Amino acid sequence: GLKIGAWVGTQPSESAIKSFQELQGRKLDIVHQFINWSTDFSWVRPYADAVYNNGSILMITWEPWEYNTVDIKNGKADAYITRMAQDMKAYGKEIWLRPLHEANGDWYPWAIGYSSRVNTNETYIAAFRHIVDIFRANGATNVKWVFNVNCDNVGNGTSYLGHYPGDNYVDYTSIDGYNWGTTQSWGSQWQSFDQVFSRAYQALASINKPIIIAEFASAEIGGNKARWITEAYNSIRTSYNKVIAAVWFHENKETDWRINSSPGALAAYREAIGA
């Protein structure tokens, strides 16, 4: 039964969660939050409490703007990692944790494609494994590890599986991707869900872990977003059998990714998610 999640456009306060649930006409199974590597668990706790009080799973994308893969694998962030592991163990509830995401792009400073050239398959895998090792040493077995790829490899040296840290360090795999429509000056084009996600899915389907669509959305311009939404959820349920969760990215950001970017898109989203 496909789990429905979202990043709701802001940090997931009680009110932010309830407002999105009202908006989409259905409970959120998963609530998505982003934090960095200078954020303590105490800052997360109030949000985590809201999510668990609502009866949802918290998925945290944990973004090391503050440390590259060399410094992580070498142990320079270990006090901070240990602290987080300690705090998450004490909290006790099941958290899905997605460190070092979209590493097959070139936009994040921990990514293999990043133009500093600091990050390799080897440094990435060593860093990921090191994080997981520290969590396990501190008894944080409630923390489930989410590997991730961007839908497209962007930048030098990037691939779907070169940076895969291995089944022993991973609970879920995941894919991020957007239909940018005609919104970007690099000549973005309208792409169906299948055109965005099939290649990455084909790679991840070779790993015996369940798959999350951890971020997805579509622009309005360049095509019919309402139809896109209908077809995306149909595609997931028809042809992406290993996908267990679809987590929308609801933010009015580069473009209007929101499920209510138009009344038509909202109507389509409400019917698509079902249940």
Ligand X SMILES: CO[C@@H]1O[C@H](CO)[C@@H](O[C@@H]2O[C@H](CO)[C@@H](S)[C@H](O)[C@H]2O)[C@H](O)[C@H]1O
Ligand Y SMILES: OC[C@H]1O[C@@H](O[C@H]2[C@H](O)[C@@H](O)[C@H](O)O[C@@H]2CO)[C@H](O)[C@@H](O)[C@@H]1O
Does 113 help bind ligand Y (rule: CB under 6 A)?
Answer: no
Determine, following the binding rule CB under 6 A, whether residue 34 of this chain makes contact with ligand X.
Answer: yes
Question: How many Cα neighbours within 13 Å face the side chain of 116?
Answer: 13
Q: Out of ligand Y, ligand X, none, which partner does residue 107 contact, by CB within 5 to 8 A per kind?
A: ligand Y
Given candidates 29, 63, 176, 256, which one binds ligand Y under the rule CB under 6 A?
A: 176
Partner in contact with 11, chosen from ligand Y, ligand X, none, beta carbon below 5 to 8 Å by kind: ligand X
Coil, helix or strand for 10? coil
Select the span of 9-17, 50-58, 150-158, 260-268 touching ligand Y (CB under 6 A).
150-158
Query: Quick check: 251 binds ligand Y (CB under 6 A)?
Result: no
256 binds ligand X (CB under 6 A): no
Q: In the complex, what is the shortest distance from the CB of residue 271 to ligand X, in angstroms, rounded to a whole number?
A: 26
How far is C-alpha 74 from the chain's CA centre? 25
52 binds ligand X (CB under 6 A): no
Two tokens, residue 82: 């240990």
63 is a site residue for ligand X (CB under 6 A): yes
The DSSP call for residue 25 is T
Q: Quick one: which of 229, 209, 211, 210 has its CA closest to 219? A: 229
How many C-beta neighbours within 10 Å does residue 122 have?
Answer: 12
Select which of 94, 215, 251, 254 is catalytic. 215
Q: Among this protein's residues, is 94 annotated catalytic?
A: no
For tokens 């990455």, the residue is 200
Q: Is 23 in the site for ligand Y (CB under 6 A)?
A: no
- Could you say whether residue 194 binds ligand Y (CB under 6 A)? no
Which residues 185-244 are close enough to bind ligand X by CB under 6 A? 215
User: Taking the CB of residue 9, how many other CB atoms lie within 10 A of it?
Assistant: 17
* CA dist., res. 245 & res. 136, Å (int): 25
Find the part of the chain contacting ligand X (CB under 6 A) among 30-38, 75-83, 119-127, 264-272. 30-38
The least CB distance from residue 79 to ligand Y, in Å, is 29
Q: Is 36 in the site for ligand X (CB under 6 A)?
A: yes
Q: Which is nearer to ligand X, 4 or 35 (CB)?
A: 35
- Rounded distance between C-alpha atoms, residue 69 and residue 146, angstroms: 17
Separation CA 85–CA 162 (nearest Å): 27
- CA–CA separation, 133 vs 130, rounded Å? 5
| Active-site annotation holder among 63, 102, 220, 251 | 102
If the CB atoms of residues 184 and 205 are measured against ligand X, the closer one turns out to be 184
> Angle of helix 121-137 relative to helix 78-91, nearest 10 degrees?
50
35 binds ligand X (CB under 6 A): yes
215 is an active site residue = yes
The secondary structure of residue 132, as a DSSP letter, is: H
How many other CB atoms sit within 10 Å of the CB of residue 196? 23
Contact residues: ligand X, CB under 6 A: 7, 11, 34-36, 63, 65, 215, 251
Return the active site residues: 102, 215
